[PDB]
């Protein structure tokens, strides 16, 4: 029943990102003293269905002069990576139990920029190419600090295994052990997904949008597992699943709140932010988190 | 560039060479070659112009290909024997690959094509460094694995280098290309004796380095890069031209000068191994190098070429910076033949 | 012969990008070849080294290559018999870099710092 | 001492991120050499048995080597439990 | 200003203390698990040796049956000059068995997730 | 065996492609990187097969140095383009033998 | 050429990584530890020429352990003969080699 | 060169210990405490001879010692042991720390019996 | 083989969904009617590459902490991080992080 | 009012409930009512292989207790 497990992982993610659009519109409306969609469906519950049907029934505007190869390749890679990032996640058991799960997520995340590069190159426009280049530069810049923060945090875990993070946070959350790294990790996840205040940029467009929102939910779930560890009882995993889902939802709503609250950066401003505030602090905290377990004789077990 | 950065880069070049020279692990030798190549590129490009950039990219491509094949030879040697120590090569295919990679690193024929262009593109100081210091590491590696070289391939490449240097030097009016072809011929002479005696290789390398340093410093002092520009030096400093003429006579292998010591010794060593035809051809071919050295001497000091009026102003000024060790280099490159038996110091 | 199949594909991708057509397409061919090679290493048992290929090589170096381009115009027998205990030997050997390979760390760090300096000096221009 | 204090006060304003970075880095460099628990961490690493303990052939000249695990001879881990 | 930094340092120290205690307990638990493995190891070694010897003997009997008519063959000849025992390779134990168990013994651990 | 042969064959193909030089110096850099990837795969397979634990650092080291070289090469390429407007190999003919 | 700075100073800059049988972490042995140890002990202090001439047995055994060419050749011969016999129709596999056996712990 | 000597299939016959990994893990500590002598003889022989064929008798001895240990456990402390190893068998990691309670019972029982 | 099947399923579903998206609206009848090369972006990419190499060096730290040579390992890890910080400082001071 | 956002969020929650729970149940269904055995480090892989050989039905999760020791 491995195919059933794979499908039961894939389909609910797609439905969740389908209804996250309605949740985002409703939350933004209510924070804007108005209402979100409440006409199509009893409370807007049919709105995602309507948008999906309209998008799938509308004419696709092929450039008629661009390279069809990369044009069709880019959304495939985007959605495939977005769906693949979910398989090692423990909630509380992963679909695929990996020794180096965290490194696997990092590698796929590094892959994710190829869709941006190829869609920009195949758009057959100089301005879209410039926008794609700017997006790629921002993404690689922030994934550097993502990697360093991730290794610093895992220094208290003992391995790259994602399930061990449940054992590490059995009594206390990792947020209490390292909140500054958590703050920079949250901001770097915001800048990785091109979310406000970093949003500086019909069918294929729907696929790209679906991949983006799946990446948002996946990043929030990874953050919840990494920093707010839920207690897991081996004889009732539903409790862990409920806690993990609630924390993921809270983090996603925080993303929407941040989008609704702030102006957006300039390009040079976010590049300066990273390279001159996050990188020095991240390096200093990486030194601190290397030295701390040795100083206090609190090295984690596995090797 | 900034003098601090320039000093750091030069020290990095020397440290890469020394890492090659002191390590017993193949990976560390490869790392030393990589460090040397990385630090060498800015030194060539120090004076920014399209010619220097072109020379730097040519040199980079050549050295990167050579280093890639060196890594391949190391991996094949490890595959056929779980060894990392630099010793006997344990495999003929790996040893052929290593020999070819080191030959392209040195610029031996038929991998000689990059040397004249790189030397012409870069300035005289970069050319001095490239033609003197950049030969130590590959030659040291070749000396360490001399007992495994196939003598046929080594001797073929050495004889080809001597012939190519002699023939290519005849056609040159640019002094840097003349130096490059001379370097190719001297590399051929150095590598023709590796299978029989590495002490002879080291002695030839020392004599060649002394002579090349002296000639490059003389060319820097009289800031000339062409034959006609060098033909004006007698009207400002005839002493420099006379010293350069004696140095050129030494570089041609004429006794009783210093440049006769290597060939003589090498010939003797080859004769001790029942090799007669090859040293004969080698001396016959070195006659060509001597011919174009003599042509330079004719145009430089033995005759007086026409001058220009604006030379008179140059009569009123003296060189502000004097290169130390230039007199010592001239003396060592001209008058050390009576001290030949000192080679037993295993120089 | 799963390993053999991967090897054949690896060579086919190399022939594809070695013809050097349209450097963007040569880069795509090299990306496919690198993926197949990482798969070979993973199927052999080198999980960390294969993931290192997949992360460093593919996501940094080929990404920078594509960025720069966009700016411009038989088996199973030779295997072991026993087990590795309660750890993975590849991870232990790789982690021995900080306890055994002090010299390697020193020379590599110096080379990387020199590389940063060299890149800045070369791209300065003037 | 006045110039250094003035520099620190001027850096704490208009540049707090760099001050925090240098402070944390320096503390991470300095503290491990002064802590007494680094020896405890080394000892804990030593006491983790990854390999099988191969027994030694008894010749009647090894009183420090126990003949059974429960024998009082050999290293103890009471200190680790008390930690 | 001061109070915010004090609160942050306080929560950092509390987390450090809690993690120190928990990690020391985890080290003790890992030592206990390793000791259980060490206690179980000799029986596993004996069983492994018996199984390897049985497989080698079965392969030897089958080789004797198959290579009877080959003129220059010698049954159970070594490829080494030394008489020291050599640990067999995977192809030596499963060379004559079915593909399913060959692929099991080769890729089961690698493919298990 | 066969697997080793394929890896070597890939290295030889990449070296031949580098030495072909149709145009587009970027293709030369890509050939160099393919050669290094082949070397990485081959060395990793050898080191893992023989259980040479301490040699497990060796692939990583190689990779790092190679990528550094790659960066260097890229910089050179860019400068050449900034002089000619293209990375064409035939434009590097100012210096001749 | 080679300047043995390590031997002069007793530094051990890179000698720890030169052979399989040299102090691996956690005492993890190489696959061919015994053959390499025997070959090294045979060839020690004798020189490359005499080592190549006189320690050929140990080096041959070490190479056989490393690449297993003779073993694969023998296995291939046995498998080919079995395939020919089963194609002809005189030999049949036992239940042990057909998956019908009784496994042991 | 030479013929590889292998023992006959009769030399490799012994009454196997037919319990799974959870049962072995549950009793691993007492098994190590009680069956130390044959196990250490076998391991010393194994590391000294470096030959599987030279250590068969000690292997049969360690199998016999394990069988005797498990027979004593069966005759004395059946049900608490069953609960303990069911505990251990449930977990995907077979952790000792989940149900120490059952362990205590088992320990108490053996301390009263053997 | 489980990861192979999972990747195959993900890629198959992505391809099928994108193909139906691109081909469903193509059955009905409708009308059916440079130079600059910024240096700064190249510098950002190269800095990313070098910093990623240093991250590749720093990656084995979670395993490096169980060696019994804790002082040497700590010294070498701090050396790597200090040289990484020095690279950042050199790029910062020579105006390599400007726009 | 604001609780009108609650329905859609609930739907999202339900979707995010499905994978994890499903995995657990499947793991319990294909591993004999127990947790799926995890095997890193290759020693517990040997334990699982030995369990498979001991069960007699080629299934590792079929546990053989003391009643099988005779
Ligand atoms: C035998 C084998 C030998 C093979 C060949 C020998 C290698 C020769 C090249 C070495 C350096 C190049 C050089 O000196 O110029 C050629 C030189 C001619 O001088 P020049 O042409 O007037 O100088 C032009 C410079 O390029 C103008 O550049 P600059 O003005 O920027 O110079 C800055 C200067 C001043 O450096 C400083 O500012 C010092 C500050 C310290 C920096 C701290 C950094 C630490 C991190 O530093 C140097 O000149 C480089 C010294 C490197 C240190 C080596 C140890 O000729 C020789 O040096 C012949 C050397 C004889 C052989 C070596 C000794 C005999 C054995
Ligand atoms: C033009 C003539 C050449 C001039 C050369 C430059 C002169 C200035 C150099 C100043 C002296 C440098 C010597 C360094 C001091 C100590 C050296 C010592 O530590 O090293 C010894 C080595 O000492 C040197 O080799 C001796 C150098 C003496 C050079 C003189 C020979 C010149 C040939 C004859 C021409 C006459 C020249 C006389 C006027 C200068 C041990 O060597 P070893 O590590 O165990 O083996 C490695 C070398 N192998 C591989 C070849 C065996
Ligand atoms: C002797 C001459 C000194 C002056 C000349 C220096 C020449 C250039 C500098 C390069 C020299 C490097 C010196 C260090 C050699 C490494 C070996 C030594 O340090 O021992 C190590 C000890 O480690 C030391 O702590 C290393 C500290 C050195 C690093 C700090 C500064 C490095 C700067 C070097 C220059 C690089 C650029 C300069 C940056 C400022 C090994 O530790 P140990 O555990 O016993 O053995 C490991 C094997 N085990 C596992 C079986 C036990
Ligand atoms: C795309 C993703 C590539 C990598 C996917 C698998 C990553 C991984 O680590 O899983 C390996 C997995 C689990 O190993 P461990 O985690 O170490 O634990 C098992 C021991 N207890 O085991 C395996 O090696 C099986 C997978 C190897 C074969 C397939 C590898 C992928 C091959 C892809 C080739 C096609 C690439 C095309 C180009 C790609 C460009 C984007
Ligand atoms: C003895 C023990 C020592 C312990 C060592 C640790 C001590 C800790 C000292 C304080 C560390 C705190 C650092 C936390 C992160 C600091 C980064 C930072 O300050 O960057 C800011 C900027 O950072 C930002 O403002 C980014 C915010 C972007 C808006 C996005 C919304 C963020 C607000 C919502 C709250 C997020 C909560 C995260 C929770 C995460 C939960 C997982 C600097 O920018 P400038 O003001 O322009 O000044 C520099 C230019 N000259
Ligand atoms: C010795 C420990 C070292 C290891 C820790 C290092 C961790 C990482 C930190 C290094 C990262 C790179 C740092 C690069 C430094 C660049 C400095 C610089 O040039 O910035 C100046 C500005 O900063 C400066 O003025 C220079 C440095 C100022 C001093 C910084 C702190 C110095 C030491 C203070 C802390 C000392 C110890 C703290 C103890 C407190 C008690 C615990 C220019 O900034 P602009 O972007 O141009 O903007 C200016 C226009 N608005």
Say how many strands of chain C there are: 0
In whole angstroms, the N-to-C terminal distance of chain C is 57 Å
Q: What's the domain count of chain C?
A: 1
Q: Roughly how many Å is the radius of gyration of chain C?
A: 19 Å
**β-strand amount of chain C:** under 5%
Query: Can you identify the CATH superfamily of chain C?
Result: NADH-ubiquinone/plastoquinone oxidoreductase chain 6, subunit NuoJ
Judged by helices, strands and strand pairing, the structural class of chain E is mainly alpha
Ligands in the model, by name, code or SMILES, are:
cardiolipin, ligand PLX, 1,2-dioleoyl-sn-glycero-3-phosphoethanolamine
CATH classification class of chain C = Mainly Alpha
Query: What is the global morphology of chain C?
Result: flat
PDB class: electron transport
Keywords: mammalian, mitochondrial, respiratory, complex I
Entry title: Membrane arm of deactive state CI from Q1-NADH dataset
Chain A: NADH-ubiquinone oxidoreductase chain 1
Question: What does this 3D model show about the protein?
Answer:
This is part of a larger assembly, with 10 protein chains of 10 kinds. Chain B is mainly α and 347 residues long. Chain B has helices spanning 3-22, 26-44, 50-80, 92-106, 114-121, 124-132, 136-144, 151-169, 175-191, 198-221, 227-230, 238-251, 260-272, 277-302, 311-314, 326-334. Chain E has helices at 2-66, 90-93, 99-111. The longest helix of chain E is centred in the N-terminal third of the chain and has 65 residues, at 2-66. Chain G contains 5 helices and no strands. The longest helix of chain G has 20 residues, at 69-88. Chain G is elongated, with a radius of gyration of 23 Å. Classes of the chains: A mainly alpha (303), B mainly alpha (347), C mainly alpha (126), D mainly alpha (83), E mainly alpha (113), F mainly alpha (97), G mainly alpha (105), H mainly alpha (114), I mainly alpha (99), J mainly alpha (70). At the C-F interface, helix 1, helix 2, helix 3, helix 4 and helix 5 of C face helix 1, helix 2 and helix 3 of F. Bound molecules: cardiolipin, the ligand CCCCCCCCCCCCCCCCC[C@@H](O)O[C@H](CO[C@H](O)CCCCCCCCCCCCCCC)COP(=O)(O)OCC[N+](C)(C)C (2 copies) and 1,2-dioleoyl-sn-glycero-3-phosphoethanolamine (PEE) (3 copies). One 1,2-dioleoyl-sn-glycero-3-phosphoethanolamine sits between chains C (31-32, 35-36, 39, 42-43, 47, 51, 54) and A (98-100, 104, 111). Chain A: It is a multi-pass membrane protein.
How is the secondary structure organized here?
The structure is cut from a larger assembly and holds 10 protein chains of 10 kinds.
Chain B: H1 3-22, H2 26-44, H3 50-80, H4 92-106, H5 114-121, H6 124-132, H7 136-144, H8 151-169, H9 175-191, H10 198-221, H11 227-230, H12 238-251, H13 260-272, H14 277-302, H15 311-314, H16 326-334
Helix pairs in contact in B: 1-2, 1-7, 2-3, 3-4, 3-5, 4-7, 5-9, 6-10, 8-9, 8-14, 9-10, 10-12, 10-13, 10-16, 12-14, 13-14
Chain G: H1 5-9, H2 33-43, H3 48-54, H4 56-67, H5 69-88
Helix pairs in contact in G: 2-4
Chain H: H1 21-26, H2 28-34, H3 36-49, H4 56-76, H5 78-90, H6 100-113
Helix pairs in contact in H: 3-4, 5-6
The structure holds cardiolipin, the ligand CCCCCCCCCCCCCCCCC[C@@H](O)O[C@H](CO[C@H](O)CCCCCCCCCCCCCCC)COP(=O)(O)OCC[N+](C)(C)C (2 copies) and 1,2-dioleoyl-sn-glycero-3-phosphoethanolamine (PEE) (3 copies).
PDB class: electron transport
Keywords: mammalian, respiratory, complex I, electron transport
Entry title: Membrane arm of deactive state CI from Q1-NADH dataset
């Amino acid at each position: 029943m491995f195919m059933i497990n794979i499908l039961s992982l894939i389909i609910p993610i797609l439905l969740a990102v389908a209804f996250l659009t309605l949740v985002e519109r409703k939350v933004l409306g209510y924070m804007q003293l108005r209402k979100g969609p409440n006409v199509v469906g009893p409370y807007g519950l049919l709105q995602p269905i309507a948008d999906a049907l309209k998008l799938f029934t509308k004419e696709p505007l092929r450039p008629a002069t661009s390279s069809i190869s990369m044009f069709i390749i880019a959304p495939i890679l985007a959605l495939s990576l977005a769906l693949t990032m979910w398989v090692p996640l423990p909630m509380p058991y992963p679909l695929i139990n990996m020794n180096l799960g965290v490194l696997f997520m990092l590698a796929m995340s590094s892959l994710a920029v190829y869709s941006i590069l190829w869609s920009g190159w195949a758009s057959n426009s100089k301005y879209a190419l410039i926008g794609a280049l700017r997006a790629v530069a921002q993404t690689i810049s922030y994934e550097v600090t993502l990697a360093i923060i991730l290794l610093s945090v895992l220094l208290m875990n003992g391995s790259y295994t994602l399930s061990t993070l449940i054992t590490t946070q059995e009594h206390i959350w990792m947020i209490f052990t390292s909140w500054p790294l958590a703050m920079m990790w949250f901001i770097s996840t915001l800048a990785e997904t091109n979310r406000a205040p970093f949003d500086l940029t019909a069918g294929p467009f729907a696929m790209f949008f679906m991949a983006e929102y799946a990446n948002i939910i996946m990043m929030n779930a990874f953050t919840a597992i990494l920093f707010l560890g839920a207690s897991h009882d081996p004889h009732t995993p539903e409790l862990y699943t409920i806690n993990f889902v609630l924390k993921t939802l809270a983090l996603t709503i925080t993303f929407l709140w941040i989008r609704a609250s702030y102006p957006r950066f300039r390009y040079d401003q976010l590049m300066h932010l990273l390279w001159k505030s996050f990188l020095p602090l991240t390096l200093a905290l990486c030194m601190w988190h290397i030295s701390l377990p040795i100083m206090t004789a609190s090295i984690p077990p596995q090797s | 560039m900034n003098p601090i950065i320039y000093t750091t880069l030069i020290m990095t070049v020397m440290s890469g060479t020394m890492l090659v020279m002191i390590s017993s692990h193949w990976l560390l030798i490869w790392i030393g070659f990589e460090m040397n190549l990385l630090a060498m590129i800015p030194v060539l490009m120090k004076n920014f112009n399209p010619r220097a950039t072109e020379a730097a990219t040519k040199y980079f491509l050549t050295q990167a290909t050579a280093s890639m094949m060196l890594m391949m030879a190391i991996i094949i040697n490890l595959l056929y024997s779980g060894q990392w120590t630099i010793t006997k090569m344990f495999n003929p295919v790996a040893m052929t690959m290593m020999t070819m990679a080191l030959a392209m690193k040195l610029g031996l024929s038929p991998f000689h094509f990059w040397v004249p262009e790189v030397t012409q593109g870069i300035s005289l100081q970069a050319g001095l460094l490239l033609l003197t210091w950049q030969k130590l590491a590959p030659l040291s590696v070749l000396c360490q694995i001399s007992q495994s070289i196939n003598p046929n391939l080594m001797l073929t490449m050495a004889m080809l280098s001597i012939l190519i240097g002699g023939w290519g030097g005849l056609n040159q009016t640019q002094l840097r290309k003349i130096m490059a072809y001379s370097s190719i011929a001297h590399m051929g002479w150095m590598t023709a004796v590796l299978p029989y005696n590495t002490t002879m290789t080291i002695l030839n390398l020392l004599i060649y380095i002394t002579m090349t340093l002296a000639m490059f410093m003389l060319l820097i002092h009289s800031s000339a890069t062409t034959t006609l520009s060098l033909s004006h030096t007698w009207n400002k400093m005839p002493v420099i031209t006379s010293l350069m003429m004696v140095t050129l006579l030494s570089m041609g292998g004429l006794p009783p000068l210093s440049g006769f010591m290597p060939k003589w010794m090498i010939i003797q060593e080859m004769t001790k191994n029942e090799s007669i035809i090859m040293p004969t051809l080698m001396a016959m071919t070195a006659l060509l190098n001597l011919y174009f050295y003599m042509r330079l001497a004719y145009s430089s000091s033995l005759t007086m070429f026409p001058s220009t009026n604006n030379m008179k102003m140059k009569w009123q000024f003296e060189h502000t910076k004097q290169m130390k060790l230039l007199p010592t280099m001239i003396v060592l490159s001209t008058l050390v033949l009576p001290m030949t038996p000192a080679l037993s110091s295993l120089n | 012969y799963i390993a053999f199949i991967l090897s054949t594909i690896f060579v086919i991708g190399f022939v594809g990008f070695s013809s050097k057509p349209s450097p963007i397409y040569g880069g795509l061919g090299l990306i496919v070849s690198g993926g197949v090679g990482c798969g070979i290493v993973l199927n052999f048992g080198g999980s960390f080294l294969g993931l290192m290929v997949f992360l460093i090589y593919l996501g940094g170096m080929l990404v920078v290559f594509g960025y720069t381009t966009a700016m411009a115009t038989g088996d199973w027998v030779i295997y072991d018999t026993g087990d590795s205990g309660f750890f993975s030997e590849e991870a232990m050997g790789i982690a021995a870099l900080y306890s055994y390979g002090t010299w390697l760390v020193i020379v590599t760090g110096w080379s990387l710092l020199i590389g940063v300096v060299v890149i800045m000096e070369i791209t300065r221009g003037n | 001492a006045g110039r250094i204090a003035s520099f620190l006060k001027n850096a704490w304003a208009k540049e707090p991120v760099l001050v925090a970075s240098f402070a944390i880095g320096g503390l991470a460099i300095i503290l491990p050499s002064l802590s007494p628990y680094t020896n405890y961490a080394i000892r804990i690493n030593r006491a983790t048995p990854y390999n099988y303990p191969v027994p030694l052939r008894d010749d009647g000249n090894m009183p420090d080597v126990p003949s059974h695990p429960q024998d009082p001879q050999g290293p103890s881990l009471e200190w680790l439990k008390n930690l | 200003g001061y109070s915010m930094f004090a609160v942050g340092i306080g929560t950092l120290l509390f987390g450090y203390w809690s993690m120190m205690k928990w990690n020391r307990e985890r080290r003790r638990l890992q030592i206990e698990d390793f000791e259980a493995r060490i206690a179980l190891m000799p029986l596993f070694q004996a069983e492994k040796d018996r199984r390897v010897l049985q497989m080698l003997r079965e392969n030897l009997e089958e080789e004797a049956i198959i290579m009877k008519d080959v003129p220059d063959w010698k049954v159970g000849e070594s490829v080494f000059h030394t008489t020291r025992w050599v640990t067999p390779m995977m192809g030596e134990l499963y060379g004559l068995r079915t593909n399913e168990e060959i692929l099991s013994a080769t890729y089961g651990f690698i493919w298990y997730t | 065996p066969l697997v080793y042969m394929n890896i070597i064959m890939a290295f030889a193909i990449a070296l031949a492609g580098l030495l072909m030089y149709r145009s587009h110096l970027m293709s030369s850099l890509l050939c160099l990187e393919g050669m290094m990837l082949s070397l990485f795969i081959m060395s990793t397979l050898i080191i893992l097969n023989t259980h040479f634990t301490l040699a497990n650092m060796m692939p990583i080291i190689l990779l790092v140095f190679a990528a550094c070289e790659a960066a260097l090469g890229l910089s050179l390429l860019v400068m050449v383009s900034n002089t000619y407007g293209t990375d064409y190999v035939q434009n590097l003919n100012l210096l001749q033998c | 050429p080679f300047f043995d700075v390590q031997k002069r100073l007793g530094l051990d800059l890179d000698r720890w990584m030169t052979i399989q049988s040299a102090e691996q972490p956690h005492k993890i042995p190489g696959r061919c530890h015994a053959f390499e140890k025997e070959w090294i002990e045979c060839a020690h202090g004798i020189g490359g020429i005499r080592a190549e001439k006189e320690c050929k047995i140990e080096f041959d055994d070490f190479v056989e352990c490393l690449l297993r060419q003779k073993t694969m050749k023998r296995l291939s011969a046995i498998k080919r003969q079995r395939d020919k016999l089963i194609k002809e129709g005189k030999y049949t596999p036992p239940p042990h080699h057909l998956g019908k056996e009784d496994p042991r712990p | 060169p030479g013929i590889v000597e292998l023992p006959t299939l009769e030399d490799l016959k012994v009454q196997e210990v037919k319990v799974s990994s959870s049962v072995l893990k549950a009793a691993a500590h007492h098994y190590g405490a009680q069956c130390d002598k044959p196990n250490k003889e076998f391991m010393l022989c194994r590391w000294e001879e470096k030959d599987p064929r030279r250590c068969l008798e000690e292997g049969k001895l360690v199998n016999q010692c394990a069988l005797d240990f498990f027979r004593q456990i069966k005759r004395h402390c059946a049900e608490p042991f069953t609960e303990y190893w069911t505990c251990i068998d449930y977990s995907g990691l077979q952790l000792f720390r989940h149900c120490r309670k059952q362990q205590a019972k088992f320990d108490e029982c053996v301390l009263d019996k053997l | 083989m489980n990861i192979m099947l999972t990747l195959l399923t993900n890629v198959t579903l992505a391809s099928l969904l994108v193909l139906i998206a691109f081909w469903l609206p193509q059955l009905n009848a409708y009308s059916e009617k440079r130079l600059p090369f910024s240096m700064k972006f190249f510098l950002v990419a190269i800095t990313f590459l070098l910093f990623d190499l240093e991250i590749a060096l720093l990656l084995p730290l979670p395993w490096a902490s169980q060696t019994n040579n804790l002082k040497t390992m700590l010294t070498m890890a701090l050396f790597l991080l200090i040289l990484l910080a020095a690279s950042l400082a050199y790029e910062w001071t020579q105006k390599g992080l400007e726009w | 009012m604001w609780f009108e956002i609650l329905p859609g969020i609930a739907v999202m929650a339900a979707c995010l409930f499905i994978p994890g729970m499903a995995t657990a149940h499947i793991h319990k269904f294909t591993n004999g009512g127990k947790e799926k055995r995890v095997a890193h480090f290759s020693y517990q892989w040997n334990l699982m292989e030995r369990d498979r050989r001991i069960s007699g039905v080629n299934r590792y999760h079929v546990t053989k207790g003391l009643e099988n020791i005779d």
